[PDB]
Amino acid sequence: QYVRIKNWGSGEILHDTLHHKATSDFTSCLGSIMNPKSLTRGPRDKPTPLEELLPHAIEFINQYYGSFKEAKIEEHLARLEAVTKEIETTGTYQLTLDELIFATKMAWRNAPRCIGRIQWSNLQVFDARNCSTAQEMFQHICRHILYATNNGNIRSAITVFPQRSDGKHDFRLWNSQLIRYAGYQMPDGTIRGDAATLEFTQLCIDLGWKPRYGRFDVLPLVLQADGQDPEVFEIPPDLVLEVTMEHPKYEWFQELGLKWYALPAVANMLLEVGGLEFPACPFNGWYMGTEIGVRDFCDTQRYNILEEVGRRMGLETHTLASLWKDRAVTEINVAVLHSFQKQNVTIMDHHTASESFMKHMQNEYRARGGCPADWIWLVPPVSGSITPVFHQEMLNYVLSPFYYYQIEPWKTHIW
Amino acid sequence: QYVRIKNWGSGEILHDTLHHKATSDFTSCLGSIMNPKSLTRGPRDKPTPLEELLPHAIEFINQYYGSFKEAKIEEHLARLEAVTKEIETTGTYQLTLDELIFATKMAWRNAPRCIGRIQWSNLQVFDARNCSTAQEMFQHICRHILYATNNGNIRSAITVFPQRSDGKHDFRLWNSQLIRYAGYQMPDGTIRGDAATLEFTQLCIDLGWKPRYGRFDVLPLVLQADGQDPEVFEIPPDLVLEVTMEHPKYEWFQELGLKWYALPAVANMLLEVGGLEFPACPFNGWYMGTEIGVRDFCDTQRYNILEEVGRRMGLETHTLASLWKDRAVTEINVAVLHSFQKQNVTIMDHHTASESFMKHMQNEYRARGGCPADWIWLVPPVSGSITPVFHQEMLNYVLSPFYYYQIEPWKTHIW
Ligand code: HEM
Ligand code: HEM
Ligand SMILES: Cc1cc(N)nc(CCNC(=O)c2ccc(C#N)cc2)c1
Ligand SMILES: Cc1cc(N)nc(CCNC(=O)c2ccc(C#N)cc2)c1
Ligand SMILES: CCCCCCCCO[C@@H]1O[C@H](CO)[C@@H](O)[C@H](O)[C@H]1O
Ligand SMILES: CCCCCCCCO[C@@H]1O[C@H](CO)[C@@H](O)[C@H](O)[C@H]1O
Ligand SMILES: C[C@H](O)[C@H](O)[C@@H]1CNc2nc(N)[nH]c(=O)c2N1
Ligand SMILES: C[C@H](O)[C@H](O)[C@@H]1CNc2nc(N)[nH]c(=O)c2N1
Numbered sequence: 001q002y003v004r005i006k007n008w009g010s011g012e013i014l015h016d017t018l019h020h021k022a023t024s025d026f027t028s029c030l031g032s033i034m035n036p037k038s039l040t041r042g043p044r045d046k047p048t049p050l051e052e053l054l055p056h057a058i059e060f061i062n063q064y065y066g067s068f069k070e071a072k073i074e075e076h077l078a079r080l081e082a083v084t085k086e087i088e089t090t091g092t093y094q095l096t097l098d099e100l101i102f103a104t105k106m107a108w109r110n111a112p113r114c115i116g117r118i119q120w121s122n123l124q125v126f127d128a129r130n131c132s133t134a135q136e137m138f139q140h141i142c143r144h145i146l147y148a149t150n151n152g153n154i155r156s157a158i159t160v161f162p163q164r165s166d167g168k169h170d171f172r173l174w175n176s177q178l179i180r181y182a183g184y185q186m187p188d189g190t191i192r193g194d195a196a197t198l199e200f201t202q203l204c205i206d207l208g209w210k211p212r213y214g215r216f217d218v219l220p221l222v223l224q225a226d227g228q229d230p231e232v233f234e235i236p237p238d239l240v241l242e243v244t245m246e247h248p249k250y251e252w253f254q255e256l257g258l259k260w261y262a263l264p265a266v267a268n269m270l271l272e273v274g275g276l277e278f279p280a281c282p283f284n285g286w287y288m289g290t291e292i293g294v295r296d297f298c299d300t301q302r303y304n305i306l307e308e309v310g311r312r313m314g315l316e317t318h319t320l321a322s323l324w325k326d327r328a329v330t331e332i333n334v335a336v337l338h339s340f341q342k343q344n345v346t347i348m349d350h351h352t353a354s355e356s357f358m359k360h361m362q363n364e365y366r367a368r369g370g371c372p373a374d375w376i377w378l379v380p381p382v383s384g385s386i387t388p389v390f391h392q393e394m395l396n397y398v399l400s401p402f403y404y405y406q407i408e409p410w411k412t413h414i415w
Numbered sequence: 416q417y418v419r420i421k422n423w424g425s426g427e428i429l430h431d432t433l434h435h436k437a438t439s440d441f442t443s444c445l446g447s448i449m450n451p452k453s454l455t456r457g458p459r460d461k462p463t464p465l466e467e468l469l470p471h472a473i474e475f476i477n478q479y480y481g482s483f484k485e486a487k488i489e490e491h492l493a494r495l496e497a498v499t500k501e502i503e504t505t506g507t508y509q510l511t512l513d514e515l516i517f518a519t520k521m522a523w524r525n526a527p528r529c530i531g532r533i534q535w536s537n538l539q540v541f542d543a544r545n546c547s548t549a550q551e552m553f554q555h556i557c558r559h560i561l562y563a564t565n566n567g568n569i570r571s572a573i574t575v576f577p578q579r580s581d582g583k584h585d586f587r588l589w590n591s592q593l594i595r596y597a598g599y600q601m602p603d604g605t606i607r608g609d610a611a612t613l614e615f616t617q618l619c620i621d622l623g624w625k626p627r628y629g630r631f632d633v634l635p636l637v638l639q640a641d642g643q644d645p646e647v648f649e650i651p652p653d654l655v656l657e658v659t660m661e662h663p664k665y666e667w668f669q670e671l672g673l674k675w676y677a678l679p680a681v682a683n684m685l686l687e688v689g690g691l692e693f694p695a696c697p698f699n700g701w702y703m704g705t706e707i708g709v710r711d712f713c714d715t716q717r718y719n720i721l722e723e724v725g726r727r728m729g730l731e732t733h734t735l736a737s738l739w740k741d742r743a744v745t746e747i748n749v750a751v752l753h754s755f756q757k758q759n760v761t762i763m764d765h766h767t768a769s770e771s772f773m774k775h776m777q778n779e780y781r782a783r784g785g786c787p788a789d790w791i792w793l794v795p796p797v798s799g800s801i802t803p804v805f806h807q808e809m810l811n812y813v814l815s816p817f818y819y820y821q822i823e824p825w826k827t828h829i830w
Contacts, residue, residue, distance in 0.1 A: 016785045
């Protein structure tokens, strides 16, 4: 009847009906959409019909075995035999640890919205498929946070929890990312901290968590093990490394009293592989300066520090054409890189990150004739055409294994 | 067999085969492509089969008549009657000047890649459908350039030449835009002027034009009237207004000896309306600072002045993470705006241009429940997320009337 369109800044919604008057099918491109059903993998009620699972399974195993320089046909056939049997006999199956490792890196390799993929082959895999209690999830997450942080010398890693079985027993981290600050709706009407985590900070309060009403309070882990309700777990502060923000030249910058955590880790995505799907598999890499400097600090709906920095710099923050916003955001980006470097915490500026991806993309084409890429996500939020990825045409398709989005757990899980 | 992908900076080509392994049809999005066949309207050999023309014709006339606050049903029916007859009798038809005016503004209104559409209702239409000789095209173009320039107080306008009839008699401007600088492959191997117009500067040489081997030589008009070969016409220098570039603070900026023309006008697009298609209809608006400051001056494959400005600013142009590129490009953008303002030539910075489009887009939805928009083109080449359009989801569809691309005339026209 109409397409639903959203403004992730104002939150405002629009319904598009005009597209019904569109001309002959061309190249209604839903590419500007944040969460298209196309990139989402929702709930379940029954195991994956064997008719579909076996095909994918065979497919994956052939891919896995086809990945060797010198094939192991003997083992390959045998493995196909073994897996079929395991499915006839159990209605599902288990991946060898190596297959899991291979799946996670391949899934990463197939993330069209990830610019750090030249690092794809370098990933640490924590096998927690045997986990069974929330508390165990918590301990696993902590090991992950500790390992990945590596005292500032950030390391990429992923913790794979138990694969979805019947659909009624899914392991799910309710948080969007492992580490994230809380957002509060102060009594004086103002909002403190991360305006983006307002609702989730509430869900946390509602589950017991005690709010500290700070500007930078690390939210708690809200974990649901097996299929049971989510248990709240506060993260051990010693495990959260942070960088206090200061400018290489503006001494007043630290006066802003800003800081940010060093670990960027996705907590709410599902890993689909050869028919099996893991609804809980947090993973992490290291930051790209613009994420913090531009999105986290300058988005209207986040910490929105632009005007404050503008004034401090003595810019004409009242005349848009003065381009004061372009001057401020850049100084902020400089602060972020400078601070991470100074405190020896791994980080990469967007310019070298982009050249990095270009090299990767070229490697990918030679290697396998392609690289699924989402231009809209790969092009940095600032200095777009100054970056090489901006001038590159890209094809965006969903391969497999893959990291899908999921329906927010508090929308489908029943207490 | 494989999709062809291009890098508009390096010119390099890639063939994508991997997409054949893509999963169930989701939302292979060809949205990052510059010229998709979807946005192109090529040549012809025979008139538009009456079976197709009449439908569109009726459609357009209904749209046109439906556009009034207080309908003119009497006239509407009559017009439908009259048009059908004209097609049965002549196999095509003529739009009333008002319909043409309405079509051009609507076509503009439907340009998904245009950020200046809040201005859509404000357009001057020059009716040159009666033109018949190249020389007449030339005189018409000049009137257009003169009118639009209006001594710096830029005015939007379009000159509609004769609509395509049989397909073998098309009016076509061979240039991409009315005003554009030449590019030369100097004897010492270096390239002078606009590296992007190298080939076209050659086609011009080949057709007689005498090269001035300058950094800013305005190319000549290469016009093909009726269906005949293209005649070369040099633009009267008095008609080309330019802005010499200088910085509000860096006195050395003018030492760079930079300047740019004030008129941005598209010359190679086709206007499709109610079944009729005009292969020649140059139109213009006024500049958005980033076009010149970022694309024209800083693209590698254009004037590529970034490193030079970096050094002048005394930046660490050898350490990418210093973000010197972000500092330089901004100063350049400042020079562009400053210079146009100083010399009283209309121009708009990208920040106010974006808010402008947001207001327009919101007006469009209320007005007609939609606004075809191409996020990839609408988001400025610098400071993307600092702009409101970056956070807006958009639907990109091809309505009608519409401005399509065409196959470069020197590829299909036969001498
Ligand atoms: C090693 C350094 C890495 C860097 C610099 C990097 C950088 C980025 C950046 C800049 C984004 C944009 C995020 C946003 O705008 O919200 C992103 C998205 C993403 N990254 Fe990477 N990444 C890295 C490692 C990883 C790893 C190890 C994985 C998986 C195992 C991965 C999976 C993804 C996925 C799936 C997305 C999409 C997130 C979403 O759609 O919300 N990345 N990454
Ligand atoms: C009045 C001020 C105007 C402004 C500021 C404006 C601005 C822009 C900008 C920034 C672009 C990007 C061009 C590029 O990156 O190559 C663009 C594209 C475009 N504009 Fe507008 N425009 C204006 C008027 C017009 C008018 C009067 C028309 C038509 C009658 C129009 C039709 C288009 C079309 C069709 C494109 C697509 C060009 C392409 O695909 O190569 N614009 N405009
Ligand atoms: C693996 C990884 C590496 C990296 N370098 N960055 C990310 C991004 C994870 N997402 C977020 O940090 C995030 C997304 C949206 C909002 C909002 N609003 C806030 C944070 C993942
Ligand atoms: C109506 C209009 C208004 C406006 N403000 N800008 C334009 C853009 C026209 N295109 C170009 O100027 C151009 C495109 C590509 C290259 C290259 N390479 C160089 C110039 C049109
Ligand atoms: C219905 C299931 C049919 C399975 C047929 C599997 C045939 C073996 O497949 C082979 O595996 C090798 C690696 O072991 C690869 O190197 C070969 O390219 C591939 O053809
Ligand atoms: C096969 C061709 C059928 C044409 C039917 C035309 C019916 C008239 O169409 C009417 O035109 C008015 C404006 O004049 C609009 O305001 C009305 O909404 C529209 O229904
Ligand atoms: C609506 C639009 O798609 C959205 O706001 C953008 C675009 N590109 C992005 N790119 C990255 N890397 N991260 C993002 O959050 C977004 N969001
Ligand atoms: C490959 C990519 O689509 C291309 O280089 C870009 C993207 N967005 C753009 N947007 C505008 N306004 N103008 C452009 O030329 C381009 N080109």
